[PDB]
Amino acid sequence: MISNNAPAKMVLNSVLTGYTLAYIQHSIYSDYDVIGRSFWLKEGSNVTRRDFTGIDTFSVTINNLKPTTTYEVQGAFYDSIIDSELLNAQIGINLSDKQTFKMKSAPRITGARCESEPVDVGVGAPIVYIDTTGEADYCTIELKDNSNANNPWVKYYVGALMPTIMFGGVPIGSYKVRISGQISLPDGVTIDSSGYYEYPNVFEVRY
Amino acid sequence: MISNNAPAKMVLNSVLTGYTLAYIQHSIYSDYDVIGRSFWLKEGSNVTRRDFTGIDTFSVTINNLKPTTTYEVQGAFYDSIIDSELLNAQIGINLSDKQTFKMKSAPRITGARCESEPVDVGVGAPIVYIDTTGEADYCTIELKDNSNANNPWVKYYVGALMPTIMFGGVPIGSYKVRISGQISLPDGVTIDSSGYYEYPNVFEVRY
Amino acid sequence: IYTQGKTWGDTKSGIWMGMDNVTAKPKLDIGNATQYIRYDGNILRISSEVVIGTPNGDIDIQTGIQGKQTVFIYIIGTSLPAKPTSPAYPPSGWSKTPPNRTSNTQNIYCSTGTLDPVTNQLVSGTSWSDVVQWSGTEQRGPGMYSLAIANLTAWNDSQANSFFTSNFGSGPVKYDVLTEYKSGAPGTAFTRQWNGSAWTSPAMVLHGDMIVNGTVTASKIVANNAFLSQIGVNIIYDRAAALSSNPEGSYKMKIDLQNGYIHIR
Amino acid sequence: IYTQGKTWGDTKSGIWMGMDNVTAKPKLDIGNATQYIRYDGNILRISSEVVIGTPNGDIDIQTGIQGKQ
Amino acid sequence: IYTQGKTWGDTKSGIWMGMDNVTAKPKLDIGNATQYIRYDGNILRISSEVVIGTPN
Amino acid sequence: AWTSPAMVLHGDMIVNGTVTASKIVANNAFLSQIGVNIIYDRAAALSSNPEGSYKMKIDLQNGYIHIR
């Protein structure tokens, strides 16, 4: 009569998605011999079994993924009585229910121009206008002086991503604007940062 | 050989408390015949039974609870075998061990006041000092000009509940004040609010 | 230049900035009576707690950052083996999952240190734990944490409690600290350390790194790691015994003061 | 007192100092969107790197310092 | 805005606070030539010792 | 890479309360009570994979001390 019951079916919460990353909050195991967790990514017709043997935490994050691609995640706790081959065969475990989610799109910029601040008197200071399209939060935006090719990249804005983004404090000159949005996850330290998508066109700001 | 199995007794992983809504994290069922999950609250004088259809999620939201009333939580899954009468008897359910939690208290305003500094030239800016006694994580405060028979309540302060709240920029008419607290459920979307508590006194803004 | 009525170091709320002709020293006063930033000619006082730096200020934008922990059971072994030396999640010819064994052999695991998913190997340092025979089935060290909130206006104890009881499923431990920032605005943030019950905001917060050419004195210091050339101490408990048990009944301790001895317990 | 077309907690590059009657607290902000010294009555935030004191601030004037092995 | 005969880098004790079109970065200086709060647009420098919080 | 910190100081630091940090570096330390999970040698701790090369280690959690 003695037995070793399988772990209960894994239950996944909403899939927090960031480009090249993921976050899945699952349930709490109850069986006495749970020793690992795994997930079967399904991109198109390709299936990837990502396995995490750490039971300490109850949140997971897939380090590597394909940008802007709908996936499918199925998770499952497994006991000690399940071997690598058995787990590969999905035999003797309770797999989570299907869940669909899509990846995020890195920010991209449409334009950049210099505009003088509307003022009631005097010479209003220039304010840089850039139109941003993408998916992120508190995207960072930088600039590079075009006088020399070795000039540093200077951050100028980390505020929330908007269809139109404005900021001041830009000295008169010509600059190449660079953007790379960020998106965090509930996990304590996981932060997602895209590549740099610089504007091909150089723009100049003047009074 | 043929046999029947009662659902395995679940374990309540954690309970987050709202002064009107209760959030509980519980383990997952492991038996095929499971049809639903039920809970048995204890007001300390009368026992109340609550059950929620569907077992898709690992969390529940118990509603319609008496504020400032500690409760005890014990429940488990009941399979198709369990009958309504048998469930009421709780004979074969094999419920989970009880757990006691304290239910928070809604905000209240201890006193209403308004003072402003005399000024040699110009006009002293009205300010409102109002002292609360609540424990909500963050509370919103509304106002309504009582001089007119009917006016729409208007929010003026949004922030953390404090022993003393300071705000200004309000018109001159005499006002009635209601205070409500809002506490965020573990789910980001859902927020548990409070019944609006209103100061019986009505006062003119200190001009 | 000052708000009407306000004077340097006056109770009424306002601001003040100007000269002190007699002392020939600039003065500044901003804030309420209880909270204020007052600068005389010789001292700068800030009553209200100050936060310097911003969350995730000095992160790599090319690549993010993340942390993970792994524990694998990895031998069909007749005798206790020597712990791995290669820092690779699959160690040197070493399995990643509990294999099948013959009756004579046994199973030995290792509490592998933190794993780096980006490199898929043990982070620099933190070698493999002591290998222990796996029989049947196999508190947490307080650490620093940060969380993102969609629309943050003030500290949210409920959100932090939900965070800990969701991720770790066990609630925060003493000396834990969580910083909450508004999504779309890392500049606005709130930080609090959980001690005993509830959260107490600290008198000051720093987000980058602190460099002091001189000395530092504090009531107590907690850090996940330290590298000290010379250390002088009278008593040294174990971390768990030191913080978990106030009476320090259970221990595995050294005693430099008074009689010096080694106690195993 | 502020530079023209500047508001507290804004991406502009001006200075703002005055009494915020809405919240009845003094306010301050010096710097651009990223590097700034923003103060609200409740809490102060300094984005930019901060240095306190100067090197050799408490060095003995009569005698210097040195090290040897 | 400044006290008369004062500049951001002067040795005179005084107050100077304003913009700088050269860098478009606000600049603030308050104190004498040896005890001051020099806030460059990019780095905040304090000379005199600072006290944070109040005891109890 | 050379990294600019968040705080720079040149006098001394005083903290009535407590100071917490991810990690600490200091040439000297004068303490009264210490509660630590494990103790290493500076040469081993700085070097990667300390337990591969360590002159003396003590595991307070496991009640073990090793000398080569």
Added chain:
Amino acid sequence: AWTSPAMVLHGDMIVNGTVTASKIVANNAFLSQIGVNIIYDRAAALSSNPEGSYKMKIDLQNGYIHIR
């Protein structure tokens, strides 16, 4: 003599990164991993000559425990 420090905190402090200092003084240190070459008694370390210390877990070169 007496001296004035760089800056004083009357409450606790939190540093999300690493903190470096010439020397540290504190009552209670709750760490998880420390790399140390030589350790003396608090009083002995404060002494001009630490050779008279009660204990020494010297690790940089000797790597031996000697109790005086």
